[PDB]
C-alpha cells in the first residue's frame, strides 16, 4: 500500500479477518511505499516479497 | 490549503473526507494524553470513563 487516505483502514481490516480461520492464512508481510522516493528506490525494498 | 484558527473539533482529521487541512490549536481528542500523565505521576487506576 501507499500514503494514499484510507490506508490506515485498509490494513486494519486485514488482520480480523485473517485470524481464526480453519484454512490457515499466512501473512507474508505488509508494504509501506511511499511514490515519491523514485522509481527506482521502489525495487530496492519491492523485490523483498 | 487552509489554516485553521481557533477550532478544536476531532472531525477535521480524517483526510477522507478534509482533503487539506491544518491547524495551529489541538483538538479536543488530544486531551486524553494529559489524563495519561496525570494518571502516573498520581498513582492512579481503575477508571471508569
Known amino acids: 500500500t501507499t500514503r ?3 490506508h490506515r483502514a485498509f490494513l486494519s481490516y486485514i488482520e480480523v479477518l485473517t485470524d481464526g480461520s480453519l ?3 499466512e501473512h ?3 508494504l ?5 522516493a523514485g522509481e527506482a528506490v521502489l525495487s530496492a525494498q ?3 516479497v | 490549503p487552509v489554516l485553521g ?4 473539533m476531532s472531525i477535521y482529521s480524517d483526510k ?8 495551529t490549536v489541538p483538538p479536543y481528542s488530544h486531551q486524553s494524553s494529559v489524563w495519561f500523565e496525570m494518571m ?3 498513582s492512579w487506576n481503575h477508571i471508569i470513563l
Do not use: C, E, N
Open chain 1, 4 to 6: 494514499a487516505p484510507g
Open chain 2, 40 to 42: 502516573r505521576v498520581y
Open chain 2, 16 to 23: 477522507s473526507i478534509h482533503l487539506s487541512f491544518l491547524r
Open chain 2, 5 to 8: 484558527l481557533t477550532t478544536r
Open chain 1, 23 to 25: 484454512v490457515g492464512w
Open chain 1, 28 to 30: 507474508r508481510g505488509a
Open chain 1, 46 to 48: 519491492l523485490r523483498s
Open chain 1, 32 to 36: 509501506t511505499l511511499d511514490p515519491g
